[PDB]
mmCIF file of C-alpha atoms in Angstrom:
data_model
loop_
_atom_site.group_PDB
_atom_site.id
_atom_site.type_symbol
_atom_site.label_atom_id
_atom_site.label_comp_id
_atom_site.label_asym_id
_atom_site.label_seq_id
_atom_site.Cartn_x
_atom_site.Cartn_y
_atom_site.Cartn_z
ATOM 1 C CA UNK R 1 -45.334 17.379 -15.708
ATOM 2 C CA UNK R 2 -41.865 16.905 -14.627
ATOM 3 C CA UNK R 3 -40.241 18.691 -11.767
ATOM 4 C CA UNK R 4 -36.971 16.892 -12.003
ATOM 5 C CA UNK R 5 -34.614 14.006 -12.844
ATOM 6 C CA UNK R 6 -31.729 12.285 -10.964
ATOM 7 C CA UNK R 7 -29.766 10.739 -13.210
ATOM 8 C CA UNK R 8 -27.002 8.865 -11.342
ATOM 9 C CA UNK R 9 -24.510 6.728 -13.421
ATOM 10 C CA UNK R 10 -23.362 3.130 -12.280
ATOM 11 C CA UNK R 11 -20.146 1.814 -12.954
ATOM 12 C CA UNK R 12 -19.946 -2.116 -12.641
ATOM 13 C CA UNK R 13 -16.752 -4.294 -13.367
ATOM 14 C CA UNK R 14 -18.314 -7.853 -15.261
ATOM 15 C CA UNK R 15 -15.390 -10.347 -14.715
ATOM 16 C CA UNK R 16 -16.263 -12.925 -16.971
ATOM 17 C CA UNK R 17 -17.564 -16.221 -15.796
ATOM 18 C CA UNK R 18 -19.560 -19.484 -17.113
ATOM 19 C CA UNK R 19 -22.045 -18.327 -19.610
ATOM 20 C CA UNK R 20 -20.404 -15.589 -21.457
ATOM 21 C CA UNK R 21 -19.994 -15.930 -25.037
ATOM 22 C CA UNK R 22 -16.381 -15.825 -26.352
ATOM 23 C CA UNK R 23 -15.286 -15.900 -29.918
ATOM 24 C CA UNK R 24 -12.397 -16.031 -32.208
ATOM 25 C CA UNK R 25 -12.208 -13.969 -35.400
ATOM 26 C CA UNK R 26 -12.987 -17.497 -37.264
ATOM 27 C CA UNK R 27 -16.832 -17.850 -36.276
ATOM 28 C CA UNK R 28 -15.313 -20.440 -33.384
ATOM 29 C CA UNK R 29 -17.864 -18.912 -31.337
ATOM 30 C CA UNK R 30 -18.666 -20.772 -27.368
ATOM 31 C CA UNK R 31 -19.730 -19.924 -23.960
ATOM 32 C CA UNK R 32 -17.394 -20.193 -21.434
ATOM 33 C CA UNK R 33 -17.624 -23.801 -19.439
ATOM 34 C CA UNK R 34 -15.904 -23.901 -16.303
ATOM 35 C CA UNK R 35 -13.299 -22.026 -14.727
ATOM 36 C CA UNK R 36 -10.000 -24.176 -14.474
ATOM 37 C CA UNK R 37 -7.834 -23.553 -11.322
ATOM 38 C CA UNK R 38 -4.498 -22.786 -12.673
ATOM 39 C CA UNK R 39 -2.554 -26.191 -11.235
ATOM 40 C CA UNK R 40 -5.906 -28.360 -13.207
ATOM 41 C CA UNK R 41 -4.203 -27.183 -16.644
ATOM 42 C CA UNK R 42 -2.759 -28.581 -18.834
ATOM 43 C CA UNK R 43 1.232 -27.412 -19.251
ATOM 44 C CA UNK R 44 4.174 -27.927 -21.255
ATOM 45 C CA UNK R 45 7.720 -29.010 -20.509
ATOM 46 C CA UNK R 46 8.454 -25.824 -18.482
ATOM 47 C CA UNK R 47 5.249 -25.392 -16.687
ATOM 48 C CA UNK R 48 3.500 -23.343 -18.781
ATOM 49 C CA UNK R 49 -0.248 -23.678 -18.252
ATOM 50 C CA UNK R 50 -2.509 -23.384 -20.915
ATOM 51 C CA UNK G 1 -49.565 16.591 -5.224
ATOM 52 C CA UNK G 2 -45.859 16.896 -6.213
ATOM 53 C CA UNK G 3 -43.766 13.803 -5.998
ATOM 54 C CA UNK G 4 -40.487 15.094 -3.262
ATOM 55 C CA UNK G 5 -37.047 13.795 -3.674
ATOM 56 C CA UNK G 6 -35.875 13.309 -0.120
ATOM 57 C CA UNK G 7 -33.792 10.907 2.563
ATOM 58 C CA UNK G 8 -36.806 10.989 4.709
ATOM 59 C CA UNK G 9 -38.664 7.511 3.183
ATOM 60 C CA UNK G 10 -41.043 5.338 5.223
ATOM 61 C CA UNK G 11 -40.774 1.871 6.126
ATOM 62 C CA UNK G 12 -36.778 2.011 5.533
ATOM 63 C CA UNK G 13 -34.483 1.886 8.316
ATOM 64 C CA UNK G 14 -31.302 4.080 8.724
ATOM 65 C CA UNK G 15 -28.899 1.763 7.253
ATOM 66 C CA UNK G 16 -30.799 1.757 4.060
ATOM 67 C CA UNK G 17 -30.285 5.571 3.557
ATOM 68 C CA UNK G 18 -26.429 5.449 5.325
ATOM 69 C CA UNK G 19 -25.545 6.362 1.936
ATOM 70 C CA UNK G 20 -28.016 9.951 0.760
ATOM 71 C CA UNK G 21 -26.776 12.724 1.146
ATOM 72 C CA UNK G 22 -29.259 15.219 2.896
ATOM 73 C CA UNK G 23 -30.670 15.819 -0.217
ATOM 74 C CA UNK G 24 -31.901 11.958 -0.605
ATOM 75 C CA UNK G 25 -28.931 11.187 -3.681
ATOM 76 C CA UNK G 26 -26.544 8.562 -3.309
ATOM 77 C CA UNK G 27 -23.557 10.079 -3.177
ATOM 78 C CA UNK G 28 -20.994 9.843 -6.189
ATOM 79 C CA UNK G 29 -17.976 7.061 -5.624
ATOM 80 C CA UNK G 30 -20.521 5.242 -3.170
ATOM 81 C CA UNK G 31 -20.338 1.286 -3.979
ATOM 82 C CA UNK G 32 -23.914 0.308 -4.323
ATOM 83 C CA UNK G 33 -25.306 -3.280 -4.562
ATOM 84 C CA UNK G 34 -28.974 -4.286 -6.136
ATOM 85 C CA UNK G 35 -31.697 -2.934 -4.209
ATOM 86 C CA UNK G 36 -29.918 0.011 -2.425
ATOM 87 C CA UNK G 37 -31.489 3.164 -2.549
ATOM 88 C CA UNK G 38 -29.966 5.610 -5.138
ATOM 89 C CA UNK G 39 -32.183 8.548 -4.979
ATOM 90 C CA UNK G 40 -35.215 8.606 -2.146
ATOM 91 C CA UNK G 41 -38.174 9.737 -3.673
ATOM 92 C CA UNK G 42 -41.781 9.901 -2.208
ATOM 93 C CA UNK G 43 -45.338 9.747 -3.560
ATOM 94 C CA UNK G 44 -48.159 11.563 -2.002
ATOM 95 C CA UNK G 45 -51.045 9.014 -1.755
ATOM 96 C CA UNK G 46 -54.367 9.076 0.052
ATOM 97 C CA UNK G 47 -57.594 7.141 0.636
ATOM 98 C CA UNK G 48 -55.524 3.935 1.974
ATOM 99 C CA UNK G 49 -58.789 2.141 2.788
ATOM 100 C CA UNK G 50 -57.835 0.141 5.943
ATOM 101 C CA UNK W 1 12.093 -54.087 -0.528
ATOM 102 C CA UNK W 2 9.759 -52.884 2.169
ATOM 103 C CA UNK W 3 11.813 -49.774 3.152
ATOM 104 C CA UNK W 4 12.560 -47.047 0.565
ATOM 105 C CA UNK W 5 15.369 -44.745 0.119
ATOM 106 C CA UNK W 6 13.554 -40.638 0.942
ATOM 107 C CA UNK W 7 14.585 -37.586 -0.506
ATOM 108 C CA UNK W 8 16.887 -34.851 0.732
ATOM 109 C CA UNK W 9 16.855 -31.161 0.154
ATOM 110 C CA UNK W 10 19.983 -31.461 -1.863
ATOM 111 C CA UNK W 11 20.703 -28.082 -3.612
ATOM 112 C CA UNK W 12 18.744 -24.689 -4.918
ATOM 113 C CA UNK W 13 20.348 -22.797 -7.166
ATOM 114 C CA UNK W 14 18.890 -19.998 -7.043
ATOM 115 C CA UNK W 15 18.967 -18.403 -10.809
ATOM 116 C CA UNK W 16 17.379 -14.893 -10.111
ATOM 117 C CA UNK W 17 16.236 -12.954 -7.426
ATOM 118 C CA UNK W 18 12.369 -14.366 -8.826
ATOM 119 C CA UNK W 19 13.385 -17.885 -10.036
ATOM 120 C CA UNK W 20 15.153 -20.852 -8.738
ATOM 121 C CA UNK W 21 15.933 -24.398 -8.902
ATOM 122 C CA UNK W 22 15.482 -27.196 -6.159
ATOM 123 C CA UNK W 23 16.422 -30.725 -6.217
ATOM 124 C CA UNK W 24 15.190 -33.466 -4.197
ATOM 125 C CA UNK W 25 17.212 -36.586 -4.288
ATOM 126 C CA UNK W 26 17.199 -39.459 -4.189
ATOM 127 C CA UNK W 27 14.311 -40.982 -5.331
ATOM 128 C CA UNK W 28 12.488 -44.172 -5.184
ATOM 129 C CA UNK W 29 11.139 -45.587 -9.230
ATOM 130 C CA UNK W 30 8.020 -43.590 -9.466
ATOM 131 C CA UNK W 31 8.124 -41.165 -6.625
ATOM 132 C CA UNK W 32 9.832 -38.642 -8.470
ATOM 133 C CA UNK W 33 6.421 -38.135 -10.430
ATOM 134 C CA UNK W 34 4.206 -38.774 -7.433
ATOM 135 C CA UNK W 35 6.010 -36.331 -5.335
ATOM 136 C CA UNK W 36 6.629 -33.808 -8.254
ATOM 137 C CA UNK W 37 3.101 -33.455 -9.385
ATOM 138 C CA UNK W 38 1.937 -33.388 -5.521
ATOM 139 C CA UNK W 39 3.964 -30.211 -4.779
ATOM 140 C CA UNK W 40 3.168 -29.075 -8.329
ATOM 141 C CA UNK W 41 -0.456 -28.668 -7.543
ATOM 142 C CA UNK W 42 0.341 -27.750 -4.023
ATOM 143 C CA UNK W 43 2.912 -24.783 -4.700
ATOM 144 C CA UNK W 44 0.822 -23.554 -7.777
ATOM 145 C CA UNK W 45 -2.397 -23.285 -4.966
ATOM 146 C CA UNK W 46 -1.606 -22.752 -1.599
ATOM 147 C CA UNK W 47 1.504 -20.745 -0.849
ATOM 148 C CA UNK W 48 0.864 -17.522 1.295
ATOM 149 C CA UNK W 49 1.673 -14.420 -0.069
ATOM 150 C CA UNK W 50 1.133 -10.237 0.918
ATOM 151 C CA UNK W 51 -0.856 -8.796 -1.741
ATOM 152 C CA UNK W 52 -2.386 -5.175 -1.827
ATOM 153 C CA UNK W 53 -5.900 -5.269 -1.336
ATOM 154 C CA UNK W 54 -6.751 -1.452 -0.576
ATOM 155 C CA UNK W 55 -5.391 1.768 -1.463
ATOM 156 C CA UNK W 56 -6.892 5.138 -0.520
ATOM 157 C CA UNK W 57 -5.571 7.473 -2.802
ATOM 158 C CA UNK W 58 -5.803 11.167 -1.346
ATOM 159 C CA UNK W 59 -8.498 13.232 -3.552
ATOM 160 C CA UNK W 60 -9.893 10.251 -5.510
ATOM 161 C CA UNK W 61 -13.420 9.212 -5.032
ATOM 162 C CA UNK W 62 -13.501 5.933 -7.302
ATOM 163 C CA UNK W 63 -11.261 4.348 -9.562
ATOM 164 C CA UNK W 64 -13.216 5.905 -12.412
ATOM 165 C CA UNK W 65 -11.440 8.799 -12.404
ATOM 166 C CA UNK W 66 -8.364 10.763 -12.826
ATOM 167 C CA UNK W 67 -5.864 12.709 -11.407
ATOM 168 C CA UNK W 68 -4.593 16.037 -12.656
ATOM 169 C CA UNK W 69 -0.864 15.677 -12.969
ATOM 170 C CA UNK W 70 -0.886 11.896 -13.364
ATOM 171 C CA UNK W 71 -0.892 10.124 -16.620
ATOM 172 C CA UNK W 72 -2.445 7.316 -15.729
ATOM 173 C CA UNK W 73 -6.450 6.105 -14.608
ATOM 174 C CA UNK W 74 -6.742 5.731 -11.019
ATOM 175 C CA UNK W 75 -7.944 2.211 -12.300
ATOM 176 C CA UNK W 76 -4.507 1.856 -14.279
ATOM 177 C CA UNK W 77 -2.938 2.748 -11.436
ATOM 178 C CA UNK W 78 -4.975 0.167 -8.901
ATOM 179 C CA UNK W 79 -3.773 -2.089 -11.704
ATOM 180 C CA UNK W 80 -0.234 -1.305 -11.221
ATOM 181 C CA UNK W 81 -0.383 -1.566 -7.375
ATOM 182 C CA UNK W 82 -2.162 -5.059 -7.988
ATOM 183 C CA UNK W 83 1.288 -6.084 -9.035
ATOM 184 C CA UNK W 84 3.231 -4.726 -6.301
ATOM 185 C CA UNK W 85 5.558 -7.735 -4.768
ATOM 186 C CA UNK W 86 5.631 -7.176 -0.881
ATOM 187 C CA UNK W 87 6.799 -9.183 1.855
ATOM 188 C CA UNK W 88 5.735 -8.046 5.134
ATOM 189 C CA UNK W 89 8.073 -10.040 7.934
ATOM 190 C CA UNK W 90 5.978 -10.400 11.101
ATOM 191 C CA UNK W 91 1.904 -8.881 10.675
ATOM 192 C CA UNK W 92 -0.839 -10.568 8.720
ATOM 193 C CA UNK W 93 -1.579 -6.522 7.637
ATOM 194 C CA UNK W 94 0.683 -3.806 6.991
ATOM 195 C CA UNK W 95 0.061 0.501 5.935
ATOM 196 C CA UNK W 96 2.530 1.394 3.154
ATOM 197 C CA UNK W 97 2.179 5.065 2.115
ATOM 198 C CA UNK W 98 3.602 6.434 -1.126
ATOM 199 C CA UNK W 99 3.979 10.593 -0.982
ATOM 200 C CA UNK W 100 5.933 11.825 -3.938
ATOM 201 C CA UNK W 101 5.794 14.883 -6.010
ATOM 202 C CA UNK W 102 7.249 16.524 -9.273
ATOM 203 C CA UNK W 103 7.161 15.365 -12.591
ATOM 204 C CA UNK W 104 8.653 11.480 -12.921
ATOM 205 C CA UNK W 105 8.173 7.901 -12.289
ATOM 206 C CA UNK W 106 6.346 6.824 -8.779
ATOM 207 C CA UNK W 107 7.796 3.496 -8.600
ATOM 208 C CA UNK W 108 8.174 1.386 -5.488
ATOM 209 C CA UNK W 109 10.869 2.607 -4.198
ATOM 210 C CA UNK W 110 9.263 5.689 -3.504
ATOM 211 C CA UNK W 111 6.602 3.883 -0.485
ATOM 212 C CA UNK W 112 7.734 5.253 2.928
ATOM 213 C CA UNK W 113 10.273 2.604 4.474
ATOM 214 C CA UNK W 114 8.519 0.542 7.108
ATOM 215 C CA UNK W 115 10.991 -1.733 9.059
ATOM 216 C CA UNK W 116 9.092 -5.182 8.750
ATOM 217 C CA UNK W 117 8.083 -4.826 4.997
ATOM 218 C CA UNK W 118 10.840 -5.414 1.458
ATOM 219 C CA UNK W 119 9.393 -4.324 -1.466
ATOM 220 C CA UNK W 120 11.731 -6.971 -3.833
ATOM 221 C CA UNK W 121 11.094 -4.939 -6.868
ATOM 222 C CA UNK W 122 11.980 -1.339 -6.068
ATOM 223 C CA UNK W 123 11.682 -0.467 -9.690
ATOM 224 C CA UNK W 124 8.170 -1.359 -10.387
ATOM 225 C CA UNK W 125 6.236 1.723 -11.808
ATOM 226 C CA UNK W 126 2.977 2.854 -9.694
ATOM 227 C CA UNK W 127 2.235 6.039 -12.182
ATOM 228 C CA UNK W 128 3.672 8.856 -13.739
ATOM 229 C CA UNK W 129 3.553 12.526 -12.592
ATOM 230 C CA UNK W 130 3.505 14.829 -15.944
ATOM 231 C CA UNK W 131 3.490 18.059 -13.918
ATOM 232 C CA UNK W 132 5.966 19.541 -11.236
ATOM 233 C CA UNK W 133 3.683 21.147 -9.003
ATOM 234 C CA UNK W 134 1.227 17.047 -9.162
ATOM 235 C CA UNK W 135 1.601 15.063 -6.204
ATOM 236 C CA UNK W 136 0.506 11.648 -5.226
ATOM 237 C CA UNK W 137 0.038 10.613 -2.327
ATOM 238 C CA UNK W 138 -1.445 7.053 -0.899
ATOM 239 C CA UNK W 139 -1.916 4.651 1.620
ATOM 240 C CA UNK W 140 -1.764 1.083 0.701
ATOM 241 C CA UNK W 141 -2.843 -1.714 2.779
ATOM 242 C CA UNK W 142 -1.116 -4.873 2.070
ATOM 243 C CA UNK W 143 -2.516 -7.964 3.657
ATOM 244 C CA UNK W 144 -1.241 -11.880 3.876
ATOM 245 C CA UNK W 145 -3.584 -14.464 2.669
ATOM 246 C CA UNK W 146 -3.228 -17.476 0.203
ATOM 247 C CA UNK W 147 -4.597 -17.931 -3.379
ATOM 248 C CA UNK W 148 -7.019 -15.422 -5.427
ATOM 249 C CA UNK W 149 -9.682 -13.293 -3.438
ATOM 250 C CA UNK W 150 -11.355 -10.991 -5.875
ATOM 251 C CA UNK W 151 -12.524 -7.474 -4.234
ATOM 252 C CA UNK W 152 -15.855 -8.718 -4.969
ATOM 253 C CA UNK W 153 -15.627 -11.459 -2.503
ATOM 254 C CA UNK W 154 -15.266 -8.727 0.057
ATOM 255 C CA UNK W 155 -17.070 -5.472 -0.311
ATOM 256 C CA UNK W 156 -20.213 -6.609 1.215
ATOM 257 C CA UNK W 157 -18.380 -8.527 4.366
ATOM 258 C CA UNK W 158 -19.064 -5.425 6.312
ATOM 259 C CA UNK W 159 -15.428 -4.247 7.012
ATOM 260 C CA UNK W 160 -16.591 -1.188 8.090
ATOM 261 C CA UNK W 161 -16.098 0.742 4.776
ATOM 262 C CA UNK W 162 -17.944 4.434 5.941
ATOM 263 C CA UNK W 163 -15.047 5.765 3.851
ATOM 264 C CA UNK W 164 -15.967 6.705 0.069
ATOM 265 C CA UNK W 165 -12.684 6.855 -1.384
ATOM 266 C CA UNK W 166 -11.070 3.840 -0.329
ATOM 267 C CA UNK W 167 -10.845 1.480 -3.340
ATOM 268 C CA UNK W 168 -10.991 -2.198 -3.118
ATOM 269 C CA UNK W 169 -7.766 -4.246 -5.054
ATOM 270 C CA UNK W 170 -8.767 -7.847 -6.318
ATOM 271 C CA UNK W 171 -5.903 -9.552 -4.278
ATOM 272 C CA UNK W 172 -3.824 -12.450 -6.218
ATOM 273 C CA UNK W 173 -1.875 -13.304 -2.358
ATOM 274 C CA UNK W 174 -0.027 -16.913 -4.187
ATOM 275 C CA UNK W 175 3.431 -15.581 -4.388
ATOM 276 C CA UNK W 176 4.386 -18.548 -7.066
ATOM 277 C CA UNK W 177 4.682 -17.591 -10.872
ATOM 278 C CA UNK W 178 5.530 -21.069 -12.574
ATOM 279 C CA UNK W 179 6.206 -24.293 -11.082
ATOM 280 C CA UNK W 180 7.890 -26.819 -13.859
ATOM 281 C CA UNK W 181 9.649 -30.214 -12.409
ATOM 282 C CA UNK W 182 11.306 -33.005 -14.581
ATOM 283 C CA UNK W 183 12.536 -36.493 -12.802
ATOM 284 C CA UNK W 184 16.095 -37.232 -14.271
ATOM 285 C CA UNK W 185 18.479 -40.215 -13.039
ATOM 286 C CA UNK W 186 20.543 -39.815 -9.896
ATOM 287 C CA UNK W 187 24.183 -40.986 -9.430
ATOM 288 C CA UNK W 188 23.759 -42.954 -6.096
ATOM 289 C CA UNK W 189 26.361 -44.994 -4.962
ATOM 290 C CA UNK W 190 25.257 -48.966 -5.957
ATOM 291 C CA UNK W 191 21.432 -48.214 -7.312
ATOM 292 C CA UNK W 192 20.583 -47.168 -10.861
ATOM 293 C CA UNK W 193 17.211 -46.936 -10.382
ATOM 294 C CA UNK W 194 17.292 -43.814 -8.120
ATOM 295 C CA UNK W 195 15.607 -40.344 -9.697
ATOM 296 C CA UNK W 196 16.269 -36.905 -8.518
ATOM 297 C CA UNK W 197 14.051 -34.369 -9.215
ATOM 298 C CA UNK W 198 14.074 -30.771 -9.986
ATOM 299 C CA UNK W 199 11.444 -28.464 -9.343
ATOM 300 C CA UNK W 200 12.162 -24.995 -11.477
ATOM 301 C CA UNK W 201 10.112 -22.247 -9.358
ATOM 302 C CA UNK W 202 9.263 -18.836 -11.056
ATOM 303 C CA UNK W 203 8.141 -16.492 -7.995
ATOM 304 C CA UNK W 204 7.395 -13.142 -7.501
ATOM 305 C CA UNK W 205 10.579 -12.631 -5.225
ATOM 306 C CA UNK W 206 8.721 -12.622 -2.085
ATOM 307 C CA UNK W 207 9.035 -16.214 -1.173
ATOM 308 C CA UNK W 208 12.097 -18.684 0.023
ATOM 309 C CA UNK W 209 12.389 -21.532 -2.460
ATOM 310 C CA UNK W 210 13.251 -24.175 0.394
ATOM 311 C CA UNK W 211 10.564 -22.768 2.621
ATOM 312 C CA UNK W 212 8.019 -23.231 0.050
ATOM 313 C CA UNK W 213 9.043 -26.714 -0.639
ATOM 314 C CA UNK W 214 8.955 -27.134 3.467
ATOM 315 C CA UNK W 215 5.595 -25.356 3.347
ATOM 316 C CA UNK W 216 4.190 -27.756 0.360
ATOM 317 C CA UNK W 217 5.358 -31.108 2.030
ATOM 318 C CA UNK W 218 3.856 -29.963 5.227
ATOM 319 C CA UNK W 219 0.696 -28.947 3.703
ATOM 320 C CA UNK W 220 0.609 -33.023 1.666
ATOM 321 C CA UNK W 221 1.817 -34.726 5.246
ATOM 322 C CA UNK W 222 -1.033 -33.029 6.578
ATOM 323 C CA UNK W 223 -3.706 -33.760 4.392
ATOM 324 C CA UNK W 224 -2.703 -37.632 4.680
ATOM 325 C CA UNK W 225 -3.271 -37.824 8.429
ATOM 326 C CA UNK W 226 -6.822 -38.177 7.494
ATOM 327 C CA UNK W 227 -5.617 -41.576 4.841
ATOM 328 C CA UNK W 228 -2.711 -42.442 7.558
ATOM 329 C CA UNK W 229 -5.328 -43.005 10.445
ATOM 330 C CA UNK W 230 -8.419 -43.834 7.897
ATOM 331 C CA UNK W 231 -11.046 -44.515 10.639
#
């Protein structure tokens, strides 16, 4: 029954944002919150954001 | 009858196919976004019973 | 009591071509916190900056692809450019293009010179061409703008993109790396009290430090017009 097929391929770039699950080798599994602006983080003596 | 893969779709303007070739496939590299048409394909109906 | 002593742009020593040191003295107890965490959040957010934000390279379709010659993704090499350190003297939008052939290092010093653009790291690697009869060649629009505009921000703001082939850079325009300050005690004449403070600035090479502290106190005096006049 089939004349033809079209396959097209889609490539998509997921940046990650709040809801996606992150994890640490440890089981310290989460889902990502909020996304901090960089001057909103917390930093060390030499500026260092976390 | 045969279903036809082809640009030439009803009820969709000219922007919607700005990106089928003349064959009625999305051409490759071509950034698509959700609904966009990636291959135009037509259905031969009949008794539309207005 | 009622008046207060202001800072001064006393010195910037400038430790690198990409990092330097400013000190604002003197200081009134407490300001040197208030002031230092003000143009903290201010230089970390809202300096302007050139970043590239397309590239059409010459056969390539998408950035899922490769080159034959080059050793590197079209991707790893939109990656590269993402990186590139421009400062374009004059225009809010400037054309680089990058020709080069036989086998070796494209690096930045191989874009075409333009008068009214410095590339600040000449040595920055674009790709590799493995072959001596590969060429690249590209044209890379760098833009000015201020803080992070992702590509997907702008693909659908219509920008008249007809072209297939011309690939969209995320665009990270802040030209500041690392802003770290620290309040120590000044040496003023009579007072003890006075601080100074130092504001260590990692950039990417294509800022001033003292402009960007102008630029950061103008952007704060600015936003308290609205407190200062409060109706």
């Amino acid at each position: 029954g089939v004349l033809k097929i079209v396959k097209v391929y889609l490539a998509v770039k997921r940046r990650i944002q709040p809801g996606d699950k992150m994890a640490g080798r440890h089981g310290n599994k989460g889902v990502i919150s909020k996304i901090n602006p960089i001057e909103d983080m917390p930093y060390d003596e030499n500026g260092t954001p976390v | 009858g045969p279903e036809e893969i082809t640009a030439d779709i009803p009820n969709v303007g000219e922007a919607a196919l700005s990106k089928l070739d003349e064959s009625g496939i999305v051409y490759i590299g071509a950034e698509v976004t959700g609904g966009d048409i990636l291959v135009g394909k037509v259905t031969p109906k009949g008794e539309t019973q207005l | 009591v009622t008046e207060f002593l202001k800072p001064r742009l006393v010195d910037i020593e400038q430790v690198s071509s990409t990092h330097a040191k400013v000190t604002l003295e003197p200081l009134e107890r407490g300001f040197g916190h208030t002031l230092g965490n003000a143009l903290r959040r201010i230089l970390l957010s809202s300096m302007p900056g050139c970043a590239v934000t397309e590239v059409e390279i010459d056969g390539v379709l998408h950035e899922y692809s490769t080159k034959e010659g080059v050793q590197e993704d079209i991707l790893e090499i939109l990656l590269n450019l993402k990186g590139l350190a421009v400062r374009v003297q004059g225009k809010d939008e400037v054309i680089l293009t990058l020709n080069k052939s036989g086998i070796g290092p494209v690096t930045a010093a191989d874009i075409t010179h333009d008068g009214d653009v410095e590339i600040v790291k000449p040595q920055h690697v674009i790709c590799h061409l493995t072959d001596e009869n590969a060429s690249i060649s590209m044209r890379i629009k760098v833009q000015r703008g201020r803080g992070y505009v992702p590509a997907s921000t702008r693909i659908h703001s219509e920008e008249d993109e007809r072209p297939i082939g011309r690939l969209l850079v995320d665009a990270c325009y802040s030209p500041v790396e690392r802003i770290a300050y620290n309040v120590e005690a000044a040496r003023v004449e009579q007072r003890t009290d006075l601080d100074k403070l130092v504001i260590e600035m990692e950039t990417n090479g294509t800022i001033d430090p003292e402009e960007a502290i102008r630029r950061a106190a103008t952007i704060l005096a600015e936003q308290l017009e609205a407190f200062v006049d409060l109706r």
